[PDB]
Design a protein around this ligand. Structure first.
Ligand SMILES: NC(=[NH2+])c1ccc2[nH]c(-c3cc(CC(=O)[O-])cc(Br)c3[O-])cc2c1
Ligand SMILES: [Ca+2]
Ligand SMILES: [Cl-]
Length: 223
């Protein structure tokens, strides 16, 4: 997260860290046994870390659970990043409490101007790499589809939306991929891609979760 602030320990109880000997992507807990992340974060040997704040220190509240299976959306396109969503089933259910909790799926899509909370342990530099130990937060609005298409002509599908600041300086970045974009208590987006991080007129692009609710429910119901 570039230009964000320190969230504060366990203030984002649905945020998870995908770990393979290091933190490589974020995710959101949607129930005690399932996590939603981005398809391009897929790899084998994933350990999901819940209740984290400092990812380099065991501070208490952490639950480390292996993923039993990862389900990348069948129509995911790694060249356009269209349908950049993945569901991860945990080997055992997590113990939910005030520090570890799931976030709700939306019932409707959000409108432009909606303010959302984006969080993650991704890079904090736009010009260089600096990875934080604790969780960073960024409040950002969803932009209109016209501004988004204007910024990324020909690259925005109906399953994506832009959120951020056209002036640059505040944005999600590598390392934050797969994590949550929560607006009014519902998971509306998944951090997916952008041109650089925090560059002027190059806002972040997020997977539009409201377009996948039925797929998520049906897939979880059958696995
Ligand atoms: N501007 C944004 N809002 C944004 C959001 C997610 C991002 N993810 C990535 C990303 C970049 C790499 C670069 C590399 O190959 O080292 C790798 C991954 Br995986 C990313 O998700 C960039 C990136 C930018
Ligand atoms: Ca920790
Ligand atoms: Cl276009």
């Amino acid at each position: 997260i570039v230009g964000g602030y320190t969230c504060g320990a366990n203030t984002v109880p649905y945020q998870v860290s995908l770990n393979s000997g290091y933190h490589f992507c974020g995710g959101s807990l949607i129930n005690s046994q399932w996590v939603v992340s981005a398809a391009h974060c897929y790899k084998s040997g994933i350990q999901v870390r819940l209740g984290e704040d400092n990812i380099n220190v065991v501070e208490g509240n952490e639950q480390f659970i292996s993923a039993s299976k990862s389900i990348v959306h069948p129509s995911y396109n790694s060249n356009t990043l269209n349908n950049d969503i993945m569901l991860i089933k945990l080997k055992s259910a997590a113990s939910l409490n005030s520090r570890v909790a799931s976030i709700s799926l939306p019932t409707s899509c959000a409108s432009a101007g909606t303010q959302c909370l984006i969080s993650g342990w991704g890079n904090t530099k736009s010009s260089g790499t600096s990875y934080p130990d604790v969780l960073k937060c960024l409040k950002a609005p969803i932009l209109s589809d016209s501004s988004c298409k204007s910024a990324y002509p020909g690259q925005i599908t109906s399953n994506m939306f832009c959120a951020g600041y056209l002036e640059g300086g505040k944005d999600s970045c590598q390392g934050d991929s797969g994590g949550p974009v929560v607006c009014s208590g519902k998971l509306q987006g998944i951090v997916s891609w952008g041109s650089g991080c925090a560059q002027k007129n190059k806002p972040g692009v997020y997977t539009k979760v409201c377009n996948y609710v039925s797929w998520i429910k049906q897939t979880i119901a059958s696995n």
